[PDB]
Each structure stands twice: as structure tokens, then as C-alpha cells.
């Protein structure tokens, strides 16, 4: 959920980027 | 079976090392090793006398002897305990069957103990016997892990004809007893 910084949902919610939400498009 | 690899290891290369070290006028004076007594104390099964015969079934399997049951000496209030009831299993094994058990213990069991930086070397009892105890029973090869209902450990008494600790240590060291030094 939005509080797991180790997932896509977490990272988005926290606004950040990393291995679990890498920046690409 | 009268062969049993550890028995041998004792005769060829443990005895001579001992004669070389302490030095001995007599063949008999050099330490022999009699009686490994294994004993499960279980208050666990007290009001349940059923759980017990499972534990004795377990002990048989690893020992090759059925244990006999020990029963409460006097009556104690604070943990249940009518002076009747079974407290636990105790098996005496000597002479071969002893050996075949200690082998398995040295080369399989203790190796399987979580952590294990080695057998404590203060447990020698001062007249030269040694004791130790195990928390779980599944560290043995004959235990399949799906046959554990509940963990029960035990107490092991290594008795030896060695008059002192020092000699007793040496004997057991040379047999391959891993010690925490």
C-alpha cells in the first residue's frame, strides 16, 4: 500500500523514484 | 554389530594417545567409557499420560532402546505433581549400542544444532564425567520433522572410568567431541 516505499504505490505516493519506481517513458 | 567405527577409533589411536599423554602402568588404568544415560524430564506431559508414549517412541528410534519411565519421588505443590505421576523417560545405553549412538551424535546431531560454537567445557563434573543437554529433538537423523508434535529436549550423562576431569576431557576430545575451548 501507499506506505510501502519498496513498491510502485509507495514511491508514487511519496513522490520519489528508485529501483521500485524507475524513471522511464 | 560388534564393529562400529567409533569403537575402533577409540581402540586404535584414542587409547595410545592417552597412554602417551598421561602415561599408564596398567591397561585398565587408561580411561574406558561406560554408560551414556539419556534422560528426558517432562512435566510437559503430567496430566496427559498419552503425550508421553510418543516421546518414548521418539527416544527408542534414536537410541534403539525403549526407555523406561521415571515417576515422581516426592509430591511438590507449586507445579502440579502428585507423588504418583510420570515425569519422564530415561534410557540407559552401554556397550556397542552406546557407541553406535555417540557416533551418530558426533557426526550428525550436534552439527545440526542452530548456532553451535561448540560443547561447553565446564560441564565436566569434577570427578571426570560430563553432561550436556539439548533443546530440540529434531537434530537427530532418525527424526523426520513431521513426526514432531512438540519439541522436547533432554539430558545426556557421559560416564567414564577416568578419575579426573582433565583425563576425561582428553578422552572425549580425542574421540571427536567438539569443544568451545
Amino acid at each position: 500500500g501507499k506506505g510501502d516505499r519498496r513498491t510502485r504505490r509507495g514511491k508514487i505516493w511519496r513522490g520519489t523514484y528508485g529501483k521500485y519506481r524507475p524513471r522511464k517513458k | 554389530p560388534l564393529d562400529v567405527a567409533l569403537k575402533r577409533k577409540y581402540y586404535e589411536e584414542v587409547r595410545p594417545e592417552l597412554i602417551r599423554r598421561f602415561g599408564y602402568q596398567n591397561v585398565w588404568e587408561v580411561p574406558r567409557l561406560e554408560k551414556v544415560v539419556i534422560n528426558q524430564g517432562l512435566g510437559e506431559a503430567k496430566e496427559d499420560a498419552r503425550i508421553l508414549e510418543k516421546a518414548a517412541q521418539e527416544l527408542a528410534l534414536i537410541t534403539g532402546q525403549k526407555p523406561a519411565v521415571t515417576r515422581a519421588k516426592k509430591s511438590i505443590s507449586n507445579f502440579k505433581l502428585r507423588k504418583g505421576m510420570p515425569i519422564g523417560l530415561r534410557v540407559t545405553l552401554r556397550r556397542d549400542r552406546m557407541w553406535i549412538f555417540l557416533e551418530k551424535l558426533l557426526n550428525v546431531a550436534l552439527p545440526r544444532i542452530r548456532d553451535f560454537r561448540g560443547l561447553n567445557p565446564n560441564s565436566f563434573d569434577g570427578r571426570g564425567n560430563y553432561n550436556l543437554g539439548l533443546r530440540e529433538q529434531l537434530i537427530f537423523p532418525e527424526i523426520t520433522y513431521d513426526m514432531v508434535d512438540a519439541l522436547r529436549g533432554m539430558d545426556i550423562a557421559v560416564v567414564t572410568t577416568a578419575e579426573t576431569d582433565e583425563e576425561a576431557r582428553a578422552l572425549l576430545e580425542l574421540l571427536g567431541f567438539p569443544f568451545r575451548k
Binding site: 519498496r6 | 545440526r112 542452530r114 548456532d115 529434531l138 520433522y145
Partner: protein, 118 residues
């Protein structure tokens, strides 16, 4: 079958059942799976004792785990206390180590509440 310490996982998945070991999970799991070249979607129930020994022997050997790990985190903390340092006092007194706020909910590290009068 059993990897470091005893720690038998079973059934389920394999790459999942690896989390159930102390010291390992998510990443470290999906890692040792292709570095022993084993299918992660397979279930620890069934697989060659071959892919079982490759698997145990890798993990147990690469990094430290339940027995020695716990004792290593243990020893770090001991060092932090008794050196006299501030992270050490907050271990001594059972209170939160990294900033935050004790005027209100520290509960996870304070215990259940112990109420008093007004």
C-alpha cells in the same frame, strides 16, 4: 528442505519461501534464484535435490544469516550502549533511536500504555 540454521520452507512458491529465512527476502531471493539458475515459479515441494543443494550451498555461503546475523546485530547494539553514546541510551532505556517524538505515540518501542492519574 532446510537451509541455513534449520528453517524449512515448503509448498507455496520457492522465491517466496526464501523470505522465511532470517536475513533474506524479496531482492536477495530473486537474486540467488538466477545465480543458481533455478526457476523461481517452482514450488519447494518438488524439485531436484540437485537444485536443492545448489540453492542451500549458495545462500548459506554468500551472506550471513539467522544464527550469526542476529548475534551480529546484537553485538552492534551492545557496542552502542556501554560506549556511552546517545544512540546507546535510547537502546538502554527502550526508547526510539532515530529522531521522532516521544511526547506521544512511541508505542511500538514503548510497549502498551501504562496509564496514570491527572
Amino acid at each position: 528442505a532446510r537451509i541455513a540454521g534449520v528453517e524449512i520452507p515448503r509448498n507455496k512458491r520457492v522465491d517466496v519461501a526464501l523470505t522465511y529465512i532470517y536475513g533474506i527476502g524479496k531482492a536477495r531471493a530473486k537474486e540467488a534464484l538466477e545465480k543458481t539458475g533455478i526457476n523461481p515459479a517452482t514450488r519447494v515441494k518438488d524439485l531436484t535435490e540437485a537444485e536443492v543443494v545448489r540453492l542451500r550451498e549458495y545462500v548459506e555461503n554468500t551472506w550471513k544469516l539467522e544464527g550469526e546475523l542476529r548475534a551480529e546485530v546484537a553485538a552492534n547494539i551492545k557496542r552502542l550502549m556501554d560506549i556511552g553514546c546517545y544512540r546507546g541510551l535510547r537502546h538502554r532505556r527502550g526508547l526510539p533511536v532515530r529522531g521522532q517524538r516521544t511526547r506521544t505515540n512511541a508505542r511500538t518501542r514503548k510497549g502498551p500504555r501504562k496509564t496514570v492519574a491527572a
